Design a protein around this ligand. Sequence first.
Ligand code: XS9
Ligand code: XS9
Lengths: 49, 615, 99, 49, 49
Amino acid sequence: YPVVFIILLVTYIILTFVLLLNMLIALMGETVGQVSKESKHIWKLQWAT
Amino acid sequence: FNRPILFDIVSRGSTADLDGLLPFLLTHKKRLTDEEFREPSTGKTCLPKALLNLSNGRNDTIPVLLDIAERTGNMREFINSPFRDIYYRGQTALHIAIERRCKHYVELLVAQGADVHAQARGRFFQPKDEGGYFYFGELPLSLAACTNQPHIVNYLTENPHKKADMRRQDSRGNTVLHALVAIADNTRENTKFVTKMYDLLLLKCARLFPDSNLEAVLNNDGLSPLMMAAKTGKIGIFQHIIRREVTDEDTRHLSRKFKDWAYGPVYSSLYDLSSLDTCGEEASVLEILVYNSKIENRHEMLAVEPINELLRDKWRKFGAVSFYINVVSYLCAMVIFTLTAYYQPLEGTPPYPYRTTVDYLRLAGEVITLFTGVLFFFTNIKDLFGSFQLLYFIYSVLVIVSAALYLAGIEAYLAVMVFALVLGWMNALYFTRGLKLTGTYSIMIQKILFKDLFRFLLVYLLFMIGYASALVSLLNPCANVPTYPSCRDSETFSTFLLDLFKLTIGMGDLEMLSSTKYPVVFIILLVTYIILTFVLLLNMLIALMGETVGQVSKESKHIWKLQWATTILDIERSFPVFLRKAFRSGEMVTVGKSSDGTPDRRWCFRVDEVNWSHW
Amino acid sequence: TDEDTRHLSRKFKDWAYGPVYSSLYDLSSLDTCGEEASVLEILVYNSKIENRHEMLAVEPINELLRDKWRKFGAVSFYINVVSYLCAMVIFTLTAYYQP
Amino acid sequence: TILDIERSFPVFLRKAFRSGEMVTVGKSSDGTPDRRWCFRVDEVNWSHW
Amino acid sequence: LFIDGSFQLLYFIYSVLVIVSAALYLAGIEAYLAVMVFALVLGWMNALY
Ligand SMILES: CCCCCCCCCC(=O)O[C@@H]1[C@@H](C)[C@@]2(O)[C@@H](C=C(CO)C[C@@]3(O)C(=O)C(C)=C[C@@H]23)[C@@H]2C(C)(C)[C@]12OC(=O)CCCCCCCCC
Ligand SMILES: CCCCCCCCCC(=O)O[C@@H]1[C@@H](C)[C@@]2(O)[C@@H](C=C(CO)C[C@@]3(O)C(=O)C(C)=C[C@@H]23)[C@@H]2C(C)(C)[C@]12OC(=O)CCCCCCCCC
């Protein structure tokens, strides 16, 4: 059945490369973006250690 | 006096103009309620015309017009005459006097006999989203309470004449406490007096008829004045109902947030769950704020005082424990369903001599699959006696469609079973409600990628159709041969646009069409197609995703609270009722013993508070 | 608010019924259909571009633009885009089918 | 855009649309109640109003 | 700031290079189409208006 195999392979290339990657990058872009205040305080805690 | 005469007489407010017209009424047997001097458009009579055109608060024509109508006989027909217009329908003269904020003439129309339960069922008197201007009530008692009149709302209850009780539902079921919610925007000037008259008409109803909770009276949608503030988005009157302590000994059953013990700075407080949380026995405020809330301040209404801990309490009582069960019993059931596709030995017309326990391990695999197929079906059956409720229904049917084709030996069994296996792992992606990071990106791409990729789709389709049809027109016709790298063919519409964006992204090597009319203009238009398109259109989308990630970062906390709320209520509404009554969050507190003593069987909730300022 | 100089106004009160007040503005020169000069043409075209976006959104000038969009603006613009798009597709065909 | 389309109309069509209404404002020196083209804006006020 | 003057100028480049590709097609020269290729893309750049 190449009629349905090409359908599911399109859902693979859409969801993995386009969707799930852009889900992850946009997640990185706002969660660990503003760690300028956080990682400064953790290093000072690490430097004191 | 004709018809436009007398309406112009009372309009200026000049008295002594008719001055003995009462014989002329009795002469030709003319009466004020007759259609002669009534305006044919609306239906306005003498007394409404005076009240709209009032001068400095008083109209001296009205005690004349009351006395003239007294002698003619029509007073019950004259005071109570609805505007039969479809734009003011039902509006008596009582509605006008309460409108224009004059206590004086309200006292006269009550004394001469009003129709104080008058339903102004006009198109003017509709909700704002229903083609109307000012909703209120549809009743004269509700006009005094919605338009901020404390003195008139007192007078309409304790009158010597016909009493307007606070219980009467209108044409759509709304009582006055439904009406105070319906005119309450959640601003500051609004929710100042709205919380006052919600109190002043609740306390008055208990010092009246003491066996009826007025708030318990439902409108004709089943909602209550708390659930009507829940569904229509209000927060000003919503906070007030939950935190409503009343210290009077007669009105103590009308109290939520009971005060409790206090050992120094460990002040306790005891909130009620009369409508906030039932175990399926009744409607719920918590179900309304999470599922169907006319999508308004859900992040502000799921925070108030007790709703914030009632979801924290259900989570670590049954919620978190049943959630990890709901993950691994679903994720293992997919792996069981996965291996029944990889190691499936039938490929159509099933192998009747199975005869192997390894085949019998796999044979139990479809039994688990058929169990999940029939149970996801039966959960969806008992719903319908909705986005994701239908996707589990798709996964339920396609198992059953496969299981019929399995026993029939139809070769299309293996084709349909993969359509379940693509869809089932998409619902494993749905079980992220509580893992903060994964649940964050789930509804990112819903609004951010149906729009921006579509917004990217316009500017690329505007460009490409322009450039490619320009550049295939730049090519030569077949005059010498049917080869695309030399001439234009029927597939030139296809193979150019395939080769068009390929040359941009990764095929930067030569790939040049030699046989053209003017090669000096082809290379220039190709250079513009590199930079005036996709390269610049990439830098747009980086600036799009650069700025629209700041919008989802603003909603970071506010989408996780609603995912976590839908997590708990889906677990809770799937349980049987005796199991939910086993898990009644809070405790059965005896708190009051009011008349017909039989003390308060009221399922309350503890919230402790640490304060040194009050101390 | 007085009697002799009431005609020197541009926001007249029209009707009121509790908190649903209705005021009635004037379009003496805020919108003229070509018989005069008009402020709404001067605001969009012949204006100093510093506060132009802050003078459109005061009172009716904000609402009068979305009202003309509601009457003939959205209609004749949507006719305009499809007529220009069906003009360039015709000009597309005169390019490829050019013997 | 909206003012660009409206210029492209002739005056005959442009007077026929005429956003607003022809109200009777209030009595003036020359008999007539100051006939002016007008536009209505409705507003809620639960305040001191 | 070219808020309306951009596309008014870009409509003028289109309105010239249709006439130029017309007149070069009118008398003798086969180089009418080289200017007309510009008239295509400017005809479709101006749909971004
Ligand atoms: C003290 C705490 C313990 C309390 C007892 C535990 C609860 C028992 C009961 C239990 O676990 O029930 C869950 C329910 C809620 C659902 O998730 C079911 C699957 C769907 C789709 O219907 C998603 C839902 O969240 C949902 O939205 C609806 C409508 C029902 C639940 C699913 C079953 C009914 C089979 C289910 O079972 C699972 O294992 C969940 C995932 C589905 C896997 C199928 C498992 C069957 C064979 C492996
Ligand atoms: C219910 C409403 C009643 C309607 C009555 C009549 C409505 C006419 C009203 C109408 O559609 O007039 C259009 C206007 C807006 C423009 O497009 C004119 C062309 C130029 C050139 O600079 C400018 C514009 O493109 C522009 O930027 C804006 C916003 C106005 C349009 C052009 C005319 C004023 C002649 C025009 O007419 C066309 O057909 C050109 C269209 C542009 C190319 C398309 C093909 C031309 C012929 C369709």
